[PDB]
Amino acid sequence: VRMNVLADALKSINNAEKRGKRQVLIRPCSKVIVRFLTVMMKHGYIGEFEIIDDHRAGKIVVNLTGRLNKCGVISPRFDVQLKDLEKWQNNLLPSRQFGFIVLTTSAGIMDHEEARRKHTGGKILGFFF
Amino acid sequence: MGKCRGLRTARKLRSHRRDQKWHDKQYKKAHLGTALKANPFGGASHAKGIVLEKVGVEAKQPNSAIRKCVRVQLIKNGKKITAFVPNDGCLNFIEENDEVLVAGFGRKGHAVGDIPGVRFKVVKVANVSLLALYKGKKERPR
Amino acid sequence: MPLAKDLLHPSPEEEKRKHKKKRLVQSPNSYFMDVKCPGCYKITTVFSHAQTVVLCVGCSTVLCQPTGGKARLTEGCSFRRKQH
Amino acid sequence: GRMHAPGKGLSQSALPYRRSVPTWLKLTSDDVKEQIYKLAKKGLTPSQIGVILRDSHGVAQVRFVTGNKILRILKSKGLAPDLPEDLYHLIKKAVAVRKHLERNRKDKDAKFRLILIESRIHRLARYYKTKRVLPPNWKYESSTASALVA
RNA sequence: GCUGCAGUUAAAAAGCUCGUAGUUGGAUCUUGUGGAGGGUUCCCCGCCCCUUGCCUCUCGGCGCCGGCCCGAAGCGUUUACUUUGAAAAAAU
RNA sequence: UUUUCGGAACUGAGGCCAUGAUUAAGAGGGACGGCCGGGGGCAUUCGUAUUGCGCCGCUAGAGGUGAAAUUCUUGGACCGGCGCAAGACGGACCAGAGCGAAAGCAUUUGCCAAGAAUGUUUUCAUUAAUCAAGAACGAAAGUCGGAGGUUCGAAGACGAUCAGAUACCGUCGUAGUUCCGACCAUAAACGAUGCCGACUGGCGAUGCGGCGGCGUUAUUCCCAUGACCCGCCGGGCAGCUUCCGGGAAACCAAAGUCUUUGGGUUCCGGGGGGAGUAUGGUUGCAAAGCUGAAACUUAAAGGAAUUGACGGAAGGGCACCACC
């Protein structure tokens, strides 16, 4: 089994970062995982990543720095309504000055600072800081 | 954790908690109500009775004293309680076969101090408080 | 790990000695071979882990004895890749 | 892991990336069809058929030289069996267990093992009947086991 | 103790397995360019095949010079979800 | 009267569609191959011992204990030799080895069905995980009905020891121990550690399969093959090692990835007693099992670790206030 793909991915990157590894191996790839890691890269918590291709489900290899501290999954996937947002944002972030809870909306996957500017809630996926 | 965290598991949570709340000690007295039924009070703060006879109770070890209680039967439930007399020499201000007003000790069903079997004290002997008898703000009406 | 790992590119053949599904891209390690034993001049093609007796239609008609691993040959002749 | 044993193992086959290999193959699509039809006549069933093709001929898989597979090829004829070979092999097995149990009645170990294989029939059946590959009136029984094995 | 507990020895995992309900369930089916709003690519019209998917038309306006063009009419397999409206007695 | 138009239904043959099938899981099921194991059932072979019996020989004590005695004995025991019968049982080889869902499972050979791991460019295409109800198996003791009855042995009867001794010890001995057919569902049924999945150090072994190899050895010089040597890949029982991390600590590569709290799911706990009792239900022939309170009482009960003291514990050493 592996009922949550996203949940198994992030624990690897958490464990790896602690030891100090700067290359990892994450499987299986999913499109959901790609856009996740895209957001995590833009802000600058991780570096460029390579998708190896198979004909099964792919595998991914990542280049990372010590900048990452902790990325989590939130299971099950709750709804957020842009007043429920603030209650969430307190609990998952160590500060008001940094960290980004991530979520998916009908306007696509993005961080919370961006979602508030689209004025649309949606389903929450994970978090990080 | 160690428990389900589905998004459709509201039933299995809300029925489980409603069951495991019954093992709690406080809850099990409150909600069975057998506490009230067993109590010589109806659950009222005080109660009124009529004196039967003075008694003395010898305190639990290591302390040794005689604690000068009374024994009283109640009006509103017709059953008997052994009740402490506070201050010094207020045994004398109680006279047998009169009414008194009783009240719990202050530990809610459990004997207080070194005296065993006594969960009650006494406040009024004839509409005149033990305080005012002792201090001298009032006097026993004979 | 020494923390110097390279997972972008595989190791020369230390990647190709691991279990077949722990390789970066999966592959079998089995192969075919084009066999022509004496006296029946035809290009027969046979799988390395055949599982079964393979026949020839000439004078010869036995070529394998089944084994759990690679099947034993009845006469030690002919190995090809072939090609890919 | 195994559905009624504790073990956890690996022996799963792994295919190559490239599927146009090995690029010398004798015979082409139409030829492969008649090669298959001959085998199904002789009492072979789709798993056996592909083995006997792969081992002694240039075919790796019929998937990689046609748009079909072994079962679909037989199905286009109407020469496909009436129920999956998978389902059959479970039912085929459980009769022999019941025979051993009649011949020896102190074998509690056998009695236990029958319950496993029995439940494994019902589970497999509950796949097929929802996919309409069996009658929805069909049910497994002692009686139906007798008739389908002989 | 949902947020937020605990189960080797402090209270505590059914002797063990099977099994219907319940709960939970792998991957897979789309990206770049001029104008407009904000940077130096990136987020209302369009373009490569698509772009609010279609037609068919006909009745009641808008046009241009009988003839022709485009808004309103059926809808995109269904839900949840999210966002906006409508709708809500007072006192507190 | 007749078409047309419009609406509807049913029937044939033909054009036009890149004319229609996602991938095949380091998910599962199923086939195939060579093996493997105190796995299970049935049948069969064998060994020695023990007790009793028969036969032969030798003569005075034999058993047993801390010390004794009950008890046994010139028709001779005990002991030695030879033969016979019965039932029980598989020693040494047998280990931080194997197999089994758990409880469990060691003489030979045959038969009957079953299973794991590994190998696989075969097949199926999500068929899964965990689980109220319900179901199978489940030591020892016990109950019912038969068979059998050596050995050991609750009960029981004696002999000692002790102030006493219904006990420890010795002798005798019933139920039982054994098998067959029915019940009974409990255990420190203990790794006192749910099941499934992912990730994160090192090293050497050992059991099973597969792969590679310079070396030796066994037979026809061989090949096929076995034994040993060296290394690799799976999955299994374990060990050693340490500033991964955890923990109250003991300790643990999981009891880790946890206030930086959320992988999936079942069962279960809430101070110590009262109590697995009361009570009603349900199951059982019986014995009992499961489900299972309250009144009332009390400020401690308990875990780990440290320092002392003590020991009819172990190892060193010493004294005529100790002994020889």
Residue closest to B107 by CA, chosen among B125, B121, B93, B126 = B121
Query: In whole angstroms, how large is the CA radius of gyration of chain D?
Result: 19
Point out the domain boundary residue: D80, D99, D121: D80
State the smallest CA–CA distance between residue D17 and chain C in angstroms. Answer: 7
Q: Which CATH number is D116's domain given? A: 1.10.287.10
* Residues D49 and D63 placed together within one structural domain of the fold: yes
The answer on whether C64 is annotated among ligand-binding residues is: no
Asked whether the beta carbons of B121 and B45 are under 8 A apart, the reply is: no
Q: Is D145 exposed, middle or buried (0-12, 13-18, 19+ CB in 10 A)?
A: middle
* Residues D101 and D137 placed together within one structural domain of the fold: yes
Q: Which residue is nearest to nucleotide F115 (CA to C1')?
A: D5
Breaks (C-N over 2.5 A) in chain C follow: none
3-state secondary structure A20-81: CCCECCECCCCHHHHHHHHHHHHCCCEEEEEEECCCCCCEEEEEECCCCCCEEECCCCCEEC
- C22 touches D at CB < 8 Å: no
* Residues A53 and A76 placed together within one structural domain of the fold: no
Q: Bridge-partner residues for C64, per DSSP? A: C73
- C6 touches A at CB < 8 Å: yes
Joined together, the tokens standing for residue A13 give: 């990157």
- B10 touches A at CB < 8 Å: no
* Closest C1' nucleotide to D8's CA: F235
* Residues D107 and D47 placed together within one structural domain of the fold: no
Point out the domain boundary residue: A45, A68, A91: A68
- C22 touches A at CB < 8 Å: no
Query: Does residue D7 lie in a domain region?
Result: no
**Can you give the residue range of the structural domain that contains C4?**
1-84
The answer on whether C37 is annotated among ligand-binding residues is: yes
User: Count of CB atoms within 10 A of residue A26's CB?
Assistant: 20
Question: Which bases in strand F are touched by protein, i.e. have an atom under 7 Å from a CB?
Answer: 21, 23-35, 39-42, 101-102, 112-129, 135-138, 181, 194, 196-201, 209-212, 223-225, 232-236, 244, 256-258, 260-271, 294-299
Phi and psi at B15, nearest 5°, equal -95, -25
Joined together, the tokens standing for residue B19 give: 């069951």
* Residues A64 and A19 placed together within one structural domain of the fold: yes
Burial B38-49 (b: 16+ CB within 10 A, else e): ebbbeeeeebeb
Q: Is C1 helix (H, G, I), strand (E, B) or coil?
A: coil
* Closest C1' nucleotide to D127's CA: F127
Calculate ∠ Cα A99-A103-A106, nearest 5°: 145
* Residues D30 and D93 placed together within one structural domain of the fold: no
Helix axis angle, D85-103 relative to D108-128, nearest 10°?
A: 160
Asked whether the beta carbons of B49 and B72 are under 8 A apart, the reply is: yes
Joined together, the tokens standing for residue C10 give: 């595989």
d(Cα C47, Cα D124) in Å, to the nearest integer?
33
* Residues A95 and A48 placed together within one structural domain of the fold: no
Which residues in range 38-77 of chain D are in contact with strand F, contact meaning CB within 7 A of any of its atoms?
A: 45-51, 54, 60-64, 67-72, 75-76
CB-CB neighbors (< 8 A) of B6 in chain A: 76
Q: Is B58 helix (H, G, I), strand (E, B) or coil?
A: strand
Output the distance from B71 CA to F50 C1' rounded to whole Å.
81
* Residues A63 and A91 placed together within one structural domain of the fold: no
Q: How many domains does chain C have?
A: 1
Which of A21, A53, A59 shows the shortest C-beta gap to C5? Answer: A21
Output the distance from B56 CA to E90 C1' rounded to whole Å.
64
* Residues A62 and A118 placed together within one structural domain of the fold: no
State the smallest CA–CA distance between residue A75 and chain B in angstroms. Answer: 8
Output the distance from D73 CA to F194 C1' rounded to whole Å.
48
For chain D, how far is it from start to end, CA to CA, in angstroms?
33
Asked whether the beta carbons of B81 and B49 are under 8 A apart, the reply is: yes
Q: Which CATH number is A106's domain given? A: 3.30.1490.10
Contacts across the A-C interface (CB distance below 8 Å): 23
Query: In whole angstroms, how large is the CA radius of gyration of chain C?
Result: 18
Q: How many domains does chain B have?
A: 1
- Do residue D22 and residue C26 have CB atoms under 8 angstroms apart? no
Q: State how beta strands A46-52 and A59-64 pair.
A: antiparallel
* Residues D66 and D99 placed together within one structural domain of the fold: no
- Do residue A52 and residue C26 have CB atoms under 8 angstroms apart? no
Q: How many domains does chain A have?
A: 2
* Residues D86 and D126 placed together within one structural domain of the fold: yes
d(Cα B15, Cα B24) in Å, to the nearest integer?
16
- Summary count for chain C: helices (H), strands (E): 0, 4
d(Cα B65, Cα B113) in Å, to the nearest integer?
12
* Residues A74 and A36 placed together within one structural domain of the fold: no
Q: How many domains does chain D have?
A: 2
Please report, for residues A73, C74, D48, D55, D102, the alpha-carbon distance to residue C35 in angstroms, rounded to integers and kept in the order given: 57, 12, 23, 13, 51
Tabulate helix, strand, coil % of chain C (nearest 5): 0, 15, 85
- Do residue B6 and residue A77 have CB atoms under 8 angstroms apart? no
**Can you give the residue range of the structural domain that contains A110?**
69-129
* Residues D47 and D71 placed together within one structural domain of the fold: yes
Q: Is D33 exposed, middle or buried (0-12, 13-18, 19+ CB in 10 A)?
A: middle
Residue closest to B113 by CA, chosen among B44, B67, B52 = B67
Q: Which residue is nearest to nucleotide F24 (CA to C1')?
A: A56
* Residues D104 and D136 placed together within one structural domain of the fold: yes
* Residues A29 and A62 placed together within one structural domain of the fold: yes
A22-25: long-range contacts, CB 8 A cutoff, minimum separation 24: A22/A63, A22/A64, A22/A65, A22/C3, A23/A61, A23/A62, A23/A63, A23/A64, A23/C5, A23/C6, A23/C7, A23/C8, A24/A61, A24/A62, A24/A64, A24/C7, A25/A59, A25/A60, A25/A61, A25/C7
The answer on whether C77 is annotated among ligand-binding residues is: no
Determine which helix (DSSP H) or strand (DSSP E) holds D89, and give its type and residue range. helix D85-103
* Residues A64 and A77 placed together within one structural domain of the fold: no
Q: Bridge-partner residues for B53, per DSSP? A: B71
Q: Which CATH number is C69's domain given? A: 2.20.25.100
**Can you give the residue range of the structural domain that contains D134?**
81-150
Resolution of the experimentally solved model in angstroms: 3.5
Q: State how beta strands B99-104 and B120-124 pair.
A: antiparallel
Residue of A nearest to C5 (CA): A23
